[PDB]
């Protein structure tokens, strides 16, 4: 049917200002993030300052779900820009400028060796064997 | 050969054996994640490494203007008479003298050796 | 040694203003790349190449002890030419080295760590290809390499 | 100007891609800084060369090197790169025609000069790195003749092979008829002579 | 309930969005004429095994841009926003990616030079002085 | 139409002669110094971080523009004179150009007021 | 040339083509299909490996040309391994008539019933391919 050869043209609209600034949040293909299971989520600035130009922390389902850290894209494009176009029933596209771009990486949740423990186990590097034992001991 | 990463922490999976059942398991260090291994081979290395450069040759070399071209070796897949020929270019080739050919025709990345 | 000969060749980075070369994986950890996949995706672009994979194995095993960026930064700072009197000074010192001293041409801004990881990933990749013999070693006499 | 131009040509920025894309695309480096990756390196290089020859956005001394077997495109804009002018060859024919020579003969009272050859895309500066990617004819009178068939893909041609010699070496007559140590000793004595 | 909580309705409703890359001059004209809401028209055409998209700028604003489409399977991209009321939300997932470029190229190299010239004006150079400062 | 092999020998020496008429031989020295003065000298002055001083009044010095006068010699009496290179070789002078920089000084005395003064051609 | 062959330092690295470490606890079901035809010959009348053996197994392939060029055969090599390591390494190998020379190694029954059982095979492999002299 016509769907195999359809052609359509829509007007482009660009609001002068919006109550919410648009940003891009990208995840790695191997993370296979799924938003259906995200019953709850938090996006907030990091606590390393304990700010506007500091990393962000993304947590899903509180402490029980996945955790991610969002880093702002350092390389700006002085000659290029990104826009998000959305489908609309009135026959006109609304375009939003990408104010920011954030790449998110998951943060593992487990008893990672502390700085003190790493300093202690580092000496083993000279003769360590059966690395599984180090985690089984810890 | 194939390397597996922990689905929980994306760290490397290391081979393990369950003394309880004696089957190979790929267990994640620092993560207590374990996966039923299927390959059964934990390591393999080829000392003579007689691997074919045809796997390493890139079809784009057909565009290099410094490579020689010959009309005597028409491509089997497309019949194009002009082909680009060159040597191994790998230090592991102890006898790096045989010629590898690449079809000069666009979108025909066929490679062979005489 | 049996343990050493079993792991083979391993990679170390001789960073600036640091007394002893740190294991390469510590720098990726210090740059904030946690999982081995996040690090290997920057070093090996074609996972279907098991030869490159076997080359990085010992580098991962040596750094296994360090699984946290702050721990990696503390480790780097601990070997710094100016030993930090505290973990916070050590981390800030290490952060300053990685932020300004390592690979300045790639960038010095707070978010250039991603570009530094790719370039450091590429430096390792070049080292792997050379050790695997897939690329010829660079020639010091080549005027293309001179200025 | 190069970095800004590459953004228009779909060069994907490293911070805007997944590592899985680095396998097939070619790495684009500017002054050794890895700027991004590109999916169609042949069209890109042709475009970069066309702009350099036209002097639109890329100055004559910028060198573009495409390492075909390594999927790398390196663009160097830095100083200190030694380079030299070479006549461009297309379809085994020199781009330099009699109209250029006639205009160069009538150099004075006409203001036509070397800069017009560069702007016309007739001659271009090749640096020692780009020379590795170049297939260079020694002379048009014999090297690009179809009967020789040694190479049918020359990219450039030397202006005169004697321009490989320096200032003191250019003073020797028939240096091609002397033992090489003798050309070296003369290059030293020429600096010690009197005049 | 927290200041960092994100309204996931955009994701829950599976809102699909298209990410498009455009030149700053193009977006600058659109931003200048943003109050008009008539910056141009976007045309989309699909066939049995091929599809094409292009944008046409309003004549009054200029005083054809085919789009190069890109696969979205290589990386999972999403769109989120931050409200001035300190409330975040997820607007949707990027289901299509494209880049806007003009159909013409030779004249575009000129327009690039025009942008480069305007961008080069701040490059201050040491001025030669005819007489010594007394 | 095209350069025939019998004309190439004459043609290539015409092209080369035009190259040396335009570029000359010492072009590497001259162009390298021209770039240094025109660009490198100015970039260094702008890239240097502005001097900030604190007592408490706050003072800031911003270097802003470089000017370079023709090589000038100052006689014992202090009269400046353009120095010709032959005079420099003969009188053992150093053929140097006076370098000047515009400096803008801003001072803040925590009194919601800032005083900005510019020292032209320092 | 026989004297030359006896003088030239020859190590297993020169005669082995490739090597691999497998996990197969049941020798009656060798993970390598080709070994099943010949390994069962040894397990038909097992000795020193009747009661127990390490499930970890190291397999080495020797180049017939490199072997014959040096006038070496699997017989003395197997004996040399057991001569050097003793009964610590149970060496089992296919008949010379096979299309490929194959040797299987497992740690002794009493060690399975000295650093490790699994990773130590890499030490053995690397050691056999470096310091062991035929
Ligand atoms: Zn894990
Ligand atoms: Zn073909």
Automatic annotation (TrEMBL), chain D:
Function: RNA-dependent RNA polymerase that catalyzes the extension of a non-coding RNA (ncRNA) at the 3'-end using the four ribonucleoside triphosphates as substrates. An internal ncRNA sequence near the 3'-end serves as a template in a single-round Pol II-mediated RNA polymerization reaction. May decrease the stability of ncRNAs that repress Pol II-mediated gene transcription. DNA-dependent RNA polymerase catalyzes the transcription of DNA into RNA using the four ribonucleoside triphosphates as substrates.
Protein name according to UniProt: DNA-directed RNA polymerase subunit beta
Annotated family: Belongs to the RNA polymerase beta chain family.
Domain RNA polymerase Rpb2: 28-90, 114-161
Compartments where located: Nucleus
Automatic annotation (TrEMBL), chain G:
Signal peptide as annotated in the record: none
Location relative to the cell: Chromosome; Cytoplasm; Nucleus
Amino acids binding Zn(2+) 10: 23
Family: Belongs to the RNA polymerase beta' chain family.
Task performed by this protein: DNA-dependent RNA polymerase catalyzes the transcription of DNA into RNA using the four ribonucleoside triphosphates as substrates.
Protein name: DNA-directed RNA polymerase subunit
Stretch of the intact protein here: 1155 to 1298 of 1984
């Amino acid at each position: 049917g016509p769907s195999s050869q359809n052609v359509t043209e829509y007007v482009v609209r660009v609001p002068k200002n919006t109550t919410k600034k648009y940003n891009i949040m990208a995840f790695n293909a191997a993370d296979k993030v799924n938003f259906a299971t995200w019953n709850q989520a938090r996006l907030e600035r990091d606590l390393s300052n304990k700010p506007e130009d500091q990393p962000w922390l993304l947590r899903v389902n509180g402490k029980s779900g996945r955790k991610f850290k969002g880093i702002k894209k350092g390389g700006v494009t002085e000659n290029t820009s990104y826009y998000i176009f959305t489908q609309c029933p009135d026959g006109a596209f609304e375009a939003f400028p990408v104010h920011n771009w954030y790449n998110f990486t998951p943060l593992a949740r487990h008893r990672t060796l502390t700085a003190e423990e790493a300093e202690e186990e580092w000496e083993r590097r000279n003769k360590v064997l059966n690395h599984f034992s180090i985690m089984q001991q810890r | 050969v194939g390397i597996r990463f922990c689905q929980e922490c994306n760290n490397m999976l290391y081979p393990k054996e369950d003394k309880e059942n004696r089957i190979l398991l790929y267990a994640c260090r620092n993560c207590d994640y374990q996966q039923e291994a299927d390959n059964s081979c934990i390591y393999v290395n080829k000392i003579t490494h007689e691997v074919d450069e045809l796997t390493q040759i890139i079809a784009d070399v057909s565009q290099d203007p410094t490579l020689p071209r010959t009309e005597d070796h028409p491509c089997q897949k497309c019949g194009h008479k002009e082909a680009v020929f060159f040597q191994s270019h790998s230090a592991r080739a102890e006898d790096a003298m045989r010629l590898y050919y690449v079809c000069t025709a666009p979108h025909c990345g066929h490679r062979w050796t005489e | 040694g049996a343990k050493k000969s079993a792991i083979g060749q391993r990679i170390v980075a001789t960073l600036p203003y640091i007394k002893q070369e740190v294991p390469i994986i510590i720098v990726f950890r210090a740059l904030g790349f946690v999982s081995d996949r996040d690090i290997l995706e920057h070093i090996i672009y074609d996972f279907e190449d098991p030869e490159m994979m076997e080359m990085v194995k010992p580098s991962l095993d040596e750094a296994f002890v360090i699984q946290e960026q702050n721990v990696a930064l503390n480790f780097i700072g601990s070997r710094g030419a100016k030993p930090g009197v505290t973990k916070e000074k050590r981390i800030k010192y290490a952060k300053e080295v990685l932020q300004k001293e390592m690979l300045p041409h790639v960038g010095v801004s707070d978010f250039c760590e991603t570009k530094k990881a790719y370039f450091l990933g590429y430096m390792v990749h070049r080292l792997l290809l050379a050790a695997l013999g897939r690329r010829e070693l660079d020639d010091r006499d080549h005027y293309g390499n001179k200025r | 100007p190069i970095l800004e131009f590459l953004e228009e040509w779909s060069m994907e920025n490293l911070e805007e891609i997944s590592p899985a894309a680095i396998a097939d695309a070619t790495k684009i480096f500017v002054n050794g800084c890895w700027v991004g990756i590109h999916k169609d390196p042949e069209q890109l290089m042709n475009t970069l060369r066309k702009l350099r020859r036209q002097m639109d956005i890329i100055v004559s001394e910028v060198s573009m090197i495409r390492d075909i077997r390594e999927r790398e495109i390196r663009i160097y804009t830095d100083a200190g790169r030694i380079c030299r002018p070479l006549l461009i060859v297309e379809k085994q024919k020199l781009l330099l025609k009699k109209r250029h020579i006639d205009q160069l003969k009538e150099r004075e009272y006409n203001n036509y000069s070397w800069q017009d050859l560069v702007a016309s895309g007739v001659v271009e500066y090749i640096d020692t790195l780009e020379e590795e990617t170049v297939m260079l004819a020694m002379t048009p009178d014999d090297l690009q003749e179809k009967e020789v068939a040694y190479c049918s893909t020359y990219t450039h041609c030397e202006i005169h092979p004697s321009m490989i010699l320096g200032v003191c070496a250019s003073i020797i007559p028939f240096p091609d008829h002397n033992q090489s140590p003798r050309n070296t000793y003369q290059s030293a004595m020429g600096k010690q002579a009197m005049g | 309930a927290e200041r960092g909580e994100l309204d996931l309705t955009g994701a829950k409703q599976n809102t699909g969005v298209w990410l498009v890359k455009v030149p700053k001059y193009l977006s600058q004209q659109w931003a200048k004429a943003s109050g008009r809401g008539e910056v141009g028209k976007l045309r989309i055409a699909k066939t049995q095994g091929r599809t094409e998209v292009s944008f046409t700028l309003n004549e009054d604003l200029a005083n054809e841009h085919p789009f190069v489409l890109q696969s979205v399977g290589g990386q999972t991209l999403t769109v989120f926003t931050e409200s001035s009321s300190d409330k975040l939300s997820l607007e949707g997932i990027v289901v299509q990616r494209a880049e806007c470029r003009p159909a013409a190229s030779e004249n575009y190299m000129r327009l690039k030079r025009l942008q480069i010239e305007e961008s080069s004006k701040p490059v201050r150079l040491s001025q030669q002085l005819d007489k010594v400062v007394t | 139409d095209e350069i025939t092999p019998d004309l190439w020998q004459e043609a290539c020496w015409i092209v080369i002669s035009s190259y040396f008429d335009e570029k000359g031989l010492v072009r590497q020295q001259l162009d390298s110094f021209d770039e240094f003065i025109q660009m490198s000298v100015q970039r260094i002055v702008e890239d240097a971080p502005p001097i900030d001083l604190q007592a408490p009044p706050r003072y800031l010095l911003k270097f802003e523009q470089i000017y370079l006068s023709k090589p000038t010699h100052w006689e014992r009496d202090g009269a400046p004179s353009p120095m010709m290179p032959n005079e420099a070789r003969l009188r053992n002078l150093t053929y140097s150009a006076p370098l000047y920089v515009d400096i803008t000084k801003t001072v803040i005395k925590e009194g919601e007021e800032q005083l900005q003064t510019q020292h032209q051609k320092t | 040339k026989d004297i030359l062959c006896r003088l030239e330092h020859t190590t297993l690295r020169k005669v082995t083509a490739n090597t691999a470490i497998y996990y197969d606890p049941n020798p009656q079901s060798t993970v390598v299909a080709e070994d099943q035809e010949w390994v069962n010959v040894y397990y038909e009348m097992p000795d020193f490996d009747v009661a127990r053996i390490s499930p970890w197994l190291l397999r080495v392939e020797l180049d017939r040309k490199h072997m014959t060029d040096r006038k070496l055969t699997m017989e003395q090599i197997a004996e040399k391994i057991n001569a050097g390591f003793g009964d610590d390494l149970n060496c089992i190998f296919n008949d010379d008539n096979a299309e490929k020379l194959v040797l299987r190694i497992r740690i002794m029954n009493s060690d399975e019933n000295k650093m490790d059982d699994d990773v130590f095979l890499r030490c053995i492999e690397s050691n056999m391919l470096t310091d062991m002299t035929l």
